[PDB]
Design a protein around this ligand. Structure first.
Ligand SMILES: *[C@@H]1O[C@H](CO)[C@@H](O[C@@H]2O[C@H](CO)[C@@H](O[C@@H]3O[C@H](CO[C@H]4O[C@H](CO[C@H]5O[C@H](CO)[C@@H](O)[C@H](O)[C@@H]5O[C@H]5O[C@H](CO)[C@@H](O)[C@H](O)[C@@H]5O)[C@@H](O)[C@H](O[C@H]5O[C@H](CO)[C@@H](O)[C@H](O)[C@@H]5O)[C@@H]4O)[C@@H](O)[C@H](O[C@H]4O[C@H](CO)[C@@H](O)[C@H](O)[C@@H]4O[C@@H]4O[C@H](CO)[C@@H](O)[C@H](O)[C@@H]4O[C@@H]4O[C@H](CO)[C@@H](O)[C@H](O)[C@@H]4O)[C@@H]3O)[C@H](O)[C@H]2NC(C)=O)[C@H](O)[C@H]1NC(C)=O
Ligand SMILES: *[C@@H]1O[C@H](CO)[C@@H](O[C@@H]2O[C@H](CO)[C@@H](O[C@@H]3O[C@H](CO[C@H]4O[C@H](CO)[C@@H](O)[C@H](O[C@H]5O[C@H](CO)[C@@H](O)[C@H](O)[C@@H]5O)[C@@H]4O)[C@@H](O)[C@H](O[C@H]4O[C@H](CO)[C@@H](O)[C@H](O)[C@@H]4O)[C@@H]3O)[C@H](O)[C@H]2NC(C)=O)[C@H](O)[C@H]1NC(C)=O
Ligand SMILES: CCCCCCCC(=O)OC[C@H](COP(=O)(O)O[C@@H]1[C@H](O)[C@H](O)[C@@H](OP(=O)(O)O)[C@H](OP(=O)(O)O)[C@H]1O)OC(=O)CCCCCCC
Ligand SMILES: CCCCCCCC(=O)OC[C@H](COP(=O)(O)O[C@@H]1[C@H](O)[C@H](O)[C@@H](OP(=O)(O)O)[C@H](OP(=O)(O)O)[C@H]1O)OC(=O)CCCCCCC
Ligand SMILES: *[C@@H]1O[C@H](CO)[C@@H](O[C@@H]2O[C@H](CO)[C@@H](O)[C@H](O)[C@H]2NC(C)=O)[C@H](O)[C@H]1NC(C)=O
Ligand SMILES: CCCCCCCCCC
Ligand SMILES: CCCCCCCCCC
Ligand SMILES: [Cl-]
Ligand SMILES: [Cl-]
Lengths: 340, 349, 332, 349, 340
């Protein structure tokens, strides 16, 4: 029996021209593609890319590989893929990709009696997606994978998603610590370069950044330090040592929070929503300390000489006890409505 | 099928890929154009930038002429490795990738007259020397130089496919820069001389300008406000010795925290950047404010401040320090003057 | 030599593209594993490193031979000549065989056709860590493998008597975890290209606690206790109590920066985050307590708020610790 | 050239590299020596060390006997890939490097009687299990074990070329160690048992001791002085409540800064090291200094200090605290006692 | 004419044994070497290595490759190198190296009528050099590149710098961010191992570090903090809150500077010149704070009971106003003379 399979396979590969595509000179060869996504990781804001591991399958019919007398779908050793024609599929936004090779090259070739070829690869790719992080950490990112044919134009090869919207699976099972995959969708279109028009398949995800991390690490420490800076407004004006120590240490603490976050957070060198909130909180603690310096100067500098009254020391503190909590609430309302 | 198969077999019959086209007769001329799909990240720490291109080269090879119904042989890399191709390399290039996922990202097309079109997809990481003395208000022209590795200009020359400006094209969405603005590219051709002879160099200069808004909100504004806090202590009464001392030292510690944080973002160079001088000057103003109070406190006769009830003729009370009164003008003015000189110097370059 | 004759005869007419018993029965493969070392667990990348000697045994009737020699002990030379199962590791982020000084592979063929194939592997395997109980978190990191292209009708894997062997566990690179034990399972996973026999090994790991107790839990507790010193200071000592209150807040803010030191930026609250945050609230409240006390007594019962704080603050922090440690060390 | 080519072509005529020499007749004995050109960095974070070696192996293959004008065939890797070589692998080896610049860094020499000398230049990264409970006063014996992968001890055995001590040689200037001292090496041999048989293992242990001077000046001395500084407050008058309160908290904040910095440099072990225990005790001492003042401040009757002129009648003034007087002795003594016990525990062993 | 060249090249490689060196069984083949240094990057103190990109040219004569009738220097395709004998040149201190392979392998073969071979490679190597950082950042480093033959002994191969001192170019155009190349040197010698004696060429650079960055960021902040702590000597003894707050915050600031410099500077795990200066300044601020506690104890502890006088607090403060600036200047004088 196994001789008949051996004879059949030898017959198929004898005289096989790997240089010729299926249906050469005729209709373009239709290639169907499915992706099973094993994982997504290393979503990099700094490098503007994400790393994707997937089972990339390609489907097409090669009548040269049709066989009869065997009611089996012949799975062959993956090294037979080198003796067969496979599509020249490439990913346009791919920066660094490899086919896994333990314990062997993670590749599959499965023939079918009608001549259909199932060609599977296990690929980890680092795909580039431009990220707009001006709303970070409340940003939402759309990262794609651009599947295209390099050499063959639309006259020679055609791409489609095998299974329609069900072509890509495993997206719902992905666990990203920092993102939630809101939606994924599939697009089939044609792209024109200077060298011709090529089929393109596009797989796009929508990543929404999880905010719970930044509530505990950024916003709550900043809010609580800002509120502490208002405690000086309820301290007697004569307590210069107390209010100055309270004011300048909150400024130092806000600096400590801001400089710590500059290290742990990704280094994105333009202004983001996270920067505006930290700068806004730093202005409030800066102004709260300037409030006492104004209060001290009014009592001592302009005392013997003899909008709040600006001449009553108690009025300035009582004014600040209302305005500073009120403006900071208004600052948050403007901040969160503009970004959420 | 048979006609195309016979042409493929006849093309390489008696063909020597070790010899360039026209060897010993004429100069092999290569037409080159670049499509930039993404001008990738620029690293100031490594002084390098990444670029993703479709590198297209075209030349004439009379040994590859064919006659048949087809006018172009849309061939793969399998045939391209069998024929002569230019040995083009990037002069300032670093570790670069010729992608081969899932197959070698190369195409070779042969017209019936022998003209070859040879494009490939590359990720070129290239050196970009940087003079960061104006950091973060610096502008750079990152180069991209390429040419033959072994063939002198008497053997292989390079030309741009079209006018040099239009021979390098960047995709509309192909700017992956976070800290820079790509202002455009300058394209030129030249000659370089080595120990092995003269070579043609094709040069593209991508112009970048660093965006300053982040450094304003992360370093410049917090440092300015820290200096203002130090100078605002001049308005406190001279009898608040613990307050004005704590005000002085903690502002110095605040500047130290900001100074260290700023230098972490700065590339590890040895000269002084524009941000270094701003930080150093802001350090001097905060340092001098504490010494200002040290002088004021040295002449404070009485340990009690004004009681808020008695009048001071002109028990007795300390007067307002003349050092304080002058420092209320000199320190804000000198820091204000420095900002005018600093910002005019570096924003006008 | 007769061994050369045997090897040449076995490869004559042999097609390595064809699985043994290709149209007859599934090719049963018996797998062993010797774990040389389990490398560091990388929480940030949700992966761990493992180094193994991976052994696979199967029968190939094309490799039967008749001679006085009963086993052909070969090196990696003949590995590419015969059919080899396409065993890959499903959760492998990155894996590599070893090539110094030669391919670290073994091939032994018995005269009845039984084939023993061994090779050394270093695998970066994905492990999704649930860090809710960090640093009191326990994990069971899997290592899955199967055939890449052969479904269960063609290749079946099966554990041997000693499935997974481990040497000196004290020599492993587990910096933050202690190896507890391992389990091996067998299951069938249905994919778009068929149903595959999947073999899993689970490595139970428990995080060590000594570093976090000295570095975070005790210093955070001492800062909270230091903030209570304010309640025993006279309320007229405005500079002393304000400086104590705001400096403990600055210290507590400094101590909070190491809570998420080597963790992914997850958005749930870990056990370490809950403790540090509560400690921050306690030092925050101690400073707010004096501000309220100072305002009503002087800057205008509340006049006795210091007496209440001397009891309530230690009691609430002791009650928090009682609930915190019971529910994270015994209630899981 | 023809004569020498015929000799080389005759060697591999009818040669099966799939079979070890002496198969079916004897055990293949491999003579091994190592020349350590540089003992590279030891990485605590990876539990590994790098070593650059000339890994030399010699054995006898009677199938490669020859006759000719020369007695030794100084060949290359091109010939070596055609013959049988030992499948030596490093048992604790991590991702190692066989250098290929500019050509394979291997040499193969065949004497006329069949003896083969086979040396390769390697960068060996090997696992070194480190138990850092005594950090930074810890010492390690990093092993370098190697042997055959596929051949048991009944087929291939390894022996040192010379006496085992003299068979591993380190170059005079090869030490690339920044944090360790290479005290010495121990060379041995043995048998390792596996499920696949018994294998010869050749073992070298490199004895390393960590240098402590950097940690004394970066961590121990600043921590000791911070503790001394905290106990210095015991000599301030009890009426300086803001002074001693700020003294207590800022030393605590100083200890926190030192504690966090010290742990950032260590490998990310989750158990307590020696340095962690020293810092923890220092943290407790600084914490106890501020608690001591709280007790002292609780019994301070009067809010004013001694005026400098009135005689204390032993208005009245506060007496010096008995808690302060005891703490001036108890705290320095207990910290000194702890230091003597701490340094004796770790420096001796 | 081109067919004549093809037959000429075919004749040269007919019967050519790649396993045999030129003049096999005769005198050693002389190999001349030129280096064009493209750049030097990543001079790492932590890893004790530097990365070098260069055009590495090798020159030798092979009589088997002599050709006649063609008055040209034949630049063949770089793949012809695989069919020719090339020297087994390696770099002893090379940790990681590669030949650039975009768009093709960056390799040159140029034959000459008299059999001369010009073999070039564009090599990027990370050569290792141990750096003595005990004087860091006021240190000079000497990093070399060892060039040796692996298999062939001095009986078979001979190296020489082709062109004398001109053999290496591009050194004067090197721009190092932190160093400045003082000079370079070419050395030819023999090295003996257990397997024989081998020729060696050594290219060594002398690197002098630039301290301009460390003056503003490393030394000056420590100097200013040390001077700042002397302000305490000009404040009255009874100002305990002022002098202690100044004293202990300068200690905290020195700790902040020292611990943060440890993170930002290269991780060199032994004592360097900079570590002594930071420790020396930390001693001065420690002694300045200790000076007040001595003053406070003398006035308040030894007051009721009734080199400066050691009984007058004003005398101690005035003594400290001179000795601390004087000793710190003396410390700086001894420090800078020792390390410069
Ligand atoms: C895109 O392009 C990239 C390239 O840019 C491409 O990657 C390349 O992929 C190919 C496969 O398609 C790889 O080639 C195979 O590599 C196997 C080993 O891979 C490991 O080692 C690599 C370095 O190879 C050196 O060392 C091995 C031994 O360790 C040696 O065999 C090699 O010749 C080579 O040795 C040279 O260099 C060393 C120094 O390095 C010198 O010391 C030595 O003297 C010599 O000069 C290394 O690069 C690999 O790492 C890469 O890949 C891994 C994944 O695999 C990845 O994780 C890493 O990150 C990294 O990317 C890896 O460590 C090698 O075993 C294969 O050789 C087999 O098979 C080929 C088939 O053509 C055959 O030609 C060989 O002769 C050999 O035959 C086998 O050998 C078996 C083992 O001994 C044996 O069991 C078999 O029986 C058979 O034995 C022979 O059989 C013949 C008859 O067939 C008979 O005549 C003989 O006598 C004998 O019996 C093969 O070379 C290549 O390494 C990859 N390169 C890189 C840079 O990654 C990628 O795939 C492309 N992608 C796509 C989608 O197209
Ligand atoms: C992330 O970001 C990317 C980039 O923005 C998003 O990708 C885009 O997604 C949308 C939604 O899925 C895509 O729109 C669809 O495109 C397909 C394919 O269009 C191609 O093929 C058509 C075949 O008939 C062809 O007509 C198209 O030609 C266009 O241009 C010509 C002029 O040149 C014009 O005449 C045509 O009308 C087209 O505009 C093109 O070659 C298309 O079939 C879809 O049509 C459906 O929806 C429209 C809605 O009006 C409806 O009218 C139709 O009847 C039909 O129901 C639709 O246009 C878009 O192509 C994607 N773009 C890219 C660059 O990929 C991605 O969605 C984002 N991800 C997430 C998660 O948000
Ligand atoms: C680094 C070292 C610097 C050393 C600088 C040393 C500078 C120096 O020596 O200043 C002295 C003086 C102090 O002025 P200040 O107003 O602070 O002190 C008053 C001054 O001493 C009067 O003389 C006193 O009156 P009297 O006659 O005693 O009744 C008065 O007593 P009272 O009315 O309060 O009771 C004091 O308050 O300052 C200047 O003249 C400012 C010039 C610009 C100084 C600019 C300094 C930056
Ligand atoms: C961390 C240590 C915690 C210790 C907690 C200890 C808590 C505790 O019980 O303190 C009580 C007492 C306070 O001593 P201290 O000298 O600080 O307080 C004096 C004491 O109260 C006298 O009784 C007062 O005189 P009188 O009689 O009223 O006229 C005197 O008033 P005046 O003369 O100033 O007007 C007070 O100053 O301490 C000890 O006896 C030392 C015990 C051993 C201390 C061992 C310390 C290591
Ligand atoms: C790994 O799998 C093997 C089976 O392949 C398990 O061994 C079985 O254990 C059960 C226990 O009830 C016995 O009934 C079977 O007879 C065993 N089969 C054997 C020995 O072939 C083994 O326990 C598994 N290891 C685990 C779960 O850690
Ligand atoms: C170096 C510290 C100087 C502190 C101020 C001194 C003022 C002296 C006025 C005569
Ligand atoms: C009476 C309360 C005094 C302290 C209040 C501090 C927080 C104010 C938030 C509005
Ligand atoms: Cl771990
Ligand atoms: Cl080291």
């Amino acid at each position: 029996n196994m001789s008949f399979v051996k004879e059949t396979v030898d017959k198929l590969l004898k005289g096989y021209d790997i240089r010729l595509r299926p249906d050469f000179g005729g209709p373009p060869v239709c290639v169907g593609m499915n992706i099973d996504i094993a994982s997504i990781d290393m979503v990099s804001e700094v490098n503007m890319d994400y790393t994707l591991t997937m089972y990339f399958q390609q489907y097409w019919r090669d009548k040269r590989l049709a066989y009869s007398g065997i009611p089996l779908n012949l799975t062959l050793d993956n090294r037979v893929a080198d003796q067969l024609w496979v599509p020249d599929t490439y990913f346009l936004n791919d920066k660094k990709s490899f086919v896994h090779g333990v314990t062997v090259k993670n590749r599959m070739i499965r023939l079918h009696p009608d001549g259909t070829v199932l060609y599977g690869l296990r690929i980890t790719t680092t795909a580039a997606c431009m990220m707009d992080l001006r709303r970070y950490p409340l940003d939402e990112q759309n990262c794609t994978l651009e599947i295209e044919s390099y050499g063959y134009t639309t006259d020679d090869i055609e791409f489609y998603w095998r299974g329609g919207d069900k072509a890509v699976t495993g997206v719902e099972r992905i666990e990203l610590p920092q993102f939630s995959i809101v939606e994924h969708r599939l697009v089939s279109r044609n792209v024109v370069f200077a060298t011709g028009a090529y089929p393109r398949l596009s797989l796009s995800f929508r990543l929404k950044r999880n905010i719970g991390y930044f509530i505990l690490q950024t916003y709550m420490p900043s809010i609580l330090i800002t509120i502490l800076s208002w405690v000086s407004f309820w301290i007697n004006y004569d307590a210069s040592a107390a209010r100055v120590a309270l004011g300048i240490t909150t400024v130092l603490t806000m600096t400590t929070i801001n400089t710590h976050l500059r290290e742990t957070l990704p280094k994105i060198p333009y202004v983001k929503a996270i920067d505006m909130y930290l700068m806004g909180c730093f202005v409030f603690v800066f102004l709260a300390l300037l409030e006492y310096a104004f209060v001290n100067y009014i009592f001592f500098g302009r005392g013997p000489q003899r909008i709040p009254d600006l001449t009553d020391v108690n009025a300035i503190d009582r004014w600040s006890r209302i305005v500073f909590p009120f403006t900071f609430s208004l600052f948050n309302l403007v901040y969160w409505l503009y970004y959420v | 099928t048979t006609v195309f198969t016979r042409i493929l077999d006849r093309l390489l019959d008696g063909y020597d890929n070790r010899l360039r086209p026209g060897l010993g007769e004429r100069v092999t001329e290569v037409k080159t154009d670049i499509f930039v799909t993404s001008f990738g990240p620029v690293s100031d720490h490594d002084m390098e930038y990444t670029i993703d291109v479709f590198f297209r080269q075209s030349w004439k090879d009379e040994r590859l002429k064919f006659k048949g119904p087809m006018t172009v042989l849309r061939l793969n890399n399998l045939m391209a490795s069998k024929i002569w191709t230019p040995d083009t390399f990037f002069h300032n290039g670093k570790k670069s990738v010729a992608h081969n996922m899932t197959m070698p990202n190369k195409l070779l097309r042969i017209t019936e007259d022998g003209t070859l079109l040879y494009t490939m997809r590359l990720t070129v990481r290239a050196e970009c020397p940087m003079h960061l003395e104006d950091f973060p208000m610096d502008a750079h022209a990152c180069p991209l130089k390429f040419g033959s590795y072994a063939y002198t200009r008497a053997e292989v020359v390079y030309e741009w496919t079209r006018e040099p400006a239009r021979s390098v094209v960047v995709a509309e969405d192909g700017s992956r820069l976070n800290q820079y603005d790509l202002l455009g590219q300058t394209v030129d051709s030249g000659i370089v001389q080595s120990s092995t002879g003269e070579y043609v160099v094709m040069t593209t200069h991508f112009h970048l300008k660093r965006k300053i808004g982040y450094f304003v909100i992360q370093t410049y504004l917090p440092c300015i406000m820290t200096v203002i806090l130090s100078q605002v202590s001049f308005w406190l009464n001279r009898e608040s010795v613990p307050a004005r001392t704590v005000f002085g030292v903690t502002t110095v510690l605040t500047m130290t925290t900001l100074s260290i944080s700023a230098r972490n973002s700065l590339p590890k160079v040895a000269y002084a950047t524009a941000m270094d001088w701003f930080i150093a000057v802001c350090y001097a103003f905060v340092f001098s404010a504490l010494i200002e109070f040290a002088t004021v406190n040295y002449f404070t006769k009485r340990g009690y401040a004004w009681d808020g009830k008695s009048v001071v003729p002109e028990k007795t009370f300390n007067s307002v320090s003349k050092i304080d009164r002058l420092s209320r003008i000199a320190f804000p003015l000198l820091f204000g003057i420095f900002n005018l000189v600093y910002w005019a110097t570096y924003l006008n370059r | 030599g007769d061994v050369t004759v045997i090897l040449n005869n076995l490869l004559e007419g042999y097609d390595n593209k064809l699985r043994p018993d290709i149209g007859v029965k599934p090719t049963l493969i018996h797998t062993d594993m010797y774990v040389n070392s389990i490398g560091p667990v990388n929480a940030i990348n949700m992966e761990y490193t493992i180094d193994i000697f991976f052994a696979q045994t199967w029968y190939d009737r094309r490799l039967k031979f008749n001679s006085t020699i009963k086993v052909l002990r070969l090196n990696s030379n003949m590995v590419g000549k015969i059919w080899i199962p396409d065993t890959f590791f499903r959760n492998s982020k990155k894996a590599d065989a070893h090539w110094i000084t030669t391919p670290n592979r073994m091939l032994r063929i018995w005269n009845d056709g039984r084939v023993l194939y061994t090779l050394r592997l270093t695998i970066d395997a994905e492990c999704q860590l649930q860090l809710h109980n960090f640093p009191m978190d326990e994990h069971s990191c899997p290592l899955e493998f199967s055939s890449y292209g052969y479904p269960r009708e063609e290749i079946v894997y099966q554990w041997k008597r000693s499935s997974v062997e481990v040497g000196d566990t004290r020599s492993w690179r587990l910096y933050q975890f202690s190896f507890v034990g391992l389990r091996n399972t067998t299951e069938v996973v249905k994919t778009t290209s068929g149903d595959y026999v999947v073999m899993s090994v689970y490595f139970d790991l428990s995080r060590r606690m000594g570093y976090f107790t000295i570095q975070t839990y005790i210093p955070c507790t001492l800062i909270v206790v230091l903030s209570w010193v304010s309640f025993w200071i006279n309320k007229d000592a405005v500079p002393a109590r304000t400086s104590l209150g705001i400096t403990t807040v600055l210290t507590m803010t400094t101590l909070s920066t190491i809570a998420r030191k080597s963790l992914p930026k997850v958005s749930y609250v870990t056990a370490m985050d809950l403790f540090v945050s509560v400690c921050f609230i306690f030092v925050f409240s101690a400073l707010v307590e004096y501000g309220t006390l100072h305002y009503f007594v002087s800057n205008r019962r509340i006049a006795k708020m210091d007496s209440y704080a001397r009891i309530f603050f230690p009691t609430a922090f002791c009650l928090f610790n009682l609930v915190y440690w019971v529910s994270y060390l015994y209630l899981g």
